[model samples]
Target: QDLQATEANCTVLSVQQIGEVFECTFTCGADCRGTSQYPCVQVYVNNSESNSRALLHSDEHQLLTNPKCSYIPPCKRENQKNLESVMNWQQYWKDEIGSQPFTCYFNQHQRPDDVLLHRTHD
Candidate 1:
């Protein structure tokens, strides 16, 4: 595992529920390096217990009511790279959802966010 491959500088800036899914916003600094000039970083949430990918929104946002968000594409350049990673979790929230812990991070660099998810049981 290339866990320590790059600097853990990128972070989930915010998380907001849109329709049924959640949008995890991310911002990467110069520390988060990539093969391309713009980081083609893939963002996702993983199960803390199993360390497995919990959910995915794909490279394109196809969900209803979802903003024309980009998931598996290069980060937007605005001073730095920015991402709006979507997580389709309406079903996940309905399924055994008891604060099932998860960690959000980037794919290209494995940059983890300090913020954690799945804490609320309501």
Candidate 2:
């Protein structure tokens, strides 16, 4: 006889955007070891060139608290404010899906700091 183990399905509770970063929270269904079971928060930022594309930052156990430090664009401009106030995630996704269906995955992994941009480039 063989027994098959199944992976638990986690649910994304809420997502909020502060500055240029979007933070999302996920809850695990079962208690697993390491980062898999831990209640995790992920931060994603829109690339400076385009708002449609986003880059996922490293995952953390604590909620994203600071707004300024959250996301830094490739080139900082005096006119450009936080992306949160400008763009809405739900609305963006609605438009994106209508144009083209895309898939996103959340995994426990770390991102490099060099890839992070400080401001938007003109």
Candidate 3:
């Protein structure tokens, strides 16, 4: 699959305007539901010196970042066996995002937890 991302998948936790300069604390946590499929995670960072440039990104499959634009889909729609099981709690057991402060967001293809539960997937 030619993996693509939608803006709807983004959850902006904290942000600094393109030309703005400052620091922030970003975090993400599990937000799982019953028998959901594997979650998509997209990590972004202010990894540049130029504001006119785009930020660095780490996609679930990282296809766009590779020298060769090829990658295996981590969550295949046609494959399922010992996956999408377990209670929601166990699904996100001890999973959390970020241990330090910075600007960031957590993006996933599947819907996030009901409230502010989180954006990470199982």
Candidate 4:
């Protein structure tokens, strides 16, 4: 007899810009277990800083500051298993952004895989 074990796969569906802020959607494969118990996705943004450790401004020169990001898991009652759970998850970065029109770099991290999510301007 043989026994095999498999690991869960996590994926990011999309990342979009809302006004000046970015919102991302993530999903996990069936191999994943414990929708309400397992760890949820985590998102972050990395911005280039000046010599003073201050965020560099984009071509638009949109003085950005305190650039932090986060994600909240959906309600455990929903037992969400896919991106659909995004709706249930509260906005973890509420007020994280001070103003609008600020340009920055961001990426998302998920279990099993830590792929970089890139953004292109229109």
Candidate 5:
């Protein structure tokens, strides 16, 4: 998929139970490939396994990458907590706005994050 990817970052930043769905929170930094300027990344864990997203809160938003975030290289945060928050990188195409889940089990090179990082020194 040109515009889809995954990550291992099912950190459960916040949990919201609405009617019957539980929303979990996590984030992936956007880069040259393309992505939102930090979205309300979530994981909806329903009473079943899932339903909508795997979840949303925080106009404050969480972080898991360098302050540079995604504009530059070394997008990954040096902070242990940050790395733990983020997972793999990818160019999101808005699936919920479009698709399955349950698998917290959450992509790429030359991929923006990759090439972008290589160019940066530190």
Candidate 6:
């Protein structure tokens, strides 16, 4: 199969913590419908200092039907570790849309959720 890619400004829908994990949900500008063959859409984060970049195997197969996607960050910390001495939730889940735009990629593939989500930037 041929490779397909899409880039759009995704809006941050919600940022909340579930159990011991922090999940960030967002919706892309473009809809990736009618591409179920492609099991995974490798979503990328353009500007992120932390290391929870790609959507990976976060049920992105539905991207073919909808533009919404969710990402579970690797770092699960209770307090914000940057520029603050005390522990707080304010900075833990930062506003990504206001700070930077989310750029995602939908590559054509026939396999299931085997590919791991990765960051585009270093």
List lDDT for all candidates, in order: 0.32, 0.30, 0.27, 0.25, 0.26, 0.28
Q: Which one wins by TM-score: 1 or 5? A: 1
Residue 18 alpha-carbon offset, candidate 3, angstroms: 28
Put down candidate 3 lDDT per residue, 9-58, tens digits, no spaces. 22222222222233322223353222212222222322211111112222
Q: What ranking of all candidate models by lDDT puts the best one first?
A: 1, 2, 6, 3, 5, 4
Q: Write the per-residue lDDT of candidate 6 for residues 1-122, one digit (tens) a residue.
A: 11232332232223222222223323233552221122223222322222223332222333444343233123222322332321222233243233232444333344432233332232
- Decide which is better by TM-score, 2 or 4: 2
| Candidate 5 lDDT, 22-116, residue by residue in tens | 22222334622332233233322222111122222122243242222222322222222323233321112122211122223214533543211
Error of 5 at 14 (Å): 2.0
lDDT of 5: 0.26
Q: How many pairs of residues collide in each model?
A: 0, 7, 1, 0, 6, 0
Q: Which of candidates 2 and 4 is the stronger one according to lDDT?
A: 2
Q: Cα deviation in Å at residue 102, candidate 5?
A: 15
lDDT of 4: 0.25
Which candidate number has the best lDDT?
1
**TM-score of each candidate?**
0.24, 0.19, 0.16, 0.15, 0.16, 0.18
Poorly placed runs, candidate 4 (over 4 Å): 1-3, 16-86, 90-122
**Which of candidates 2 and 6 reaches a greater TM-score?**
2
Give residue 102's lDDT in candidate 1 (0 to 100). Answer: 34
- Model 2, span 1-122: residue lDDT tens: 00122222222222443433233222233542221111222333322121122333333322355333433442212233334533464455436442232223222234421222122212
Off by over 4 Å in 2: 1-3, 16-32, 36-122
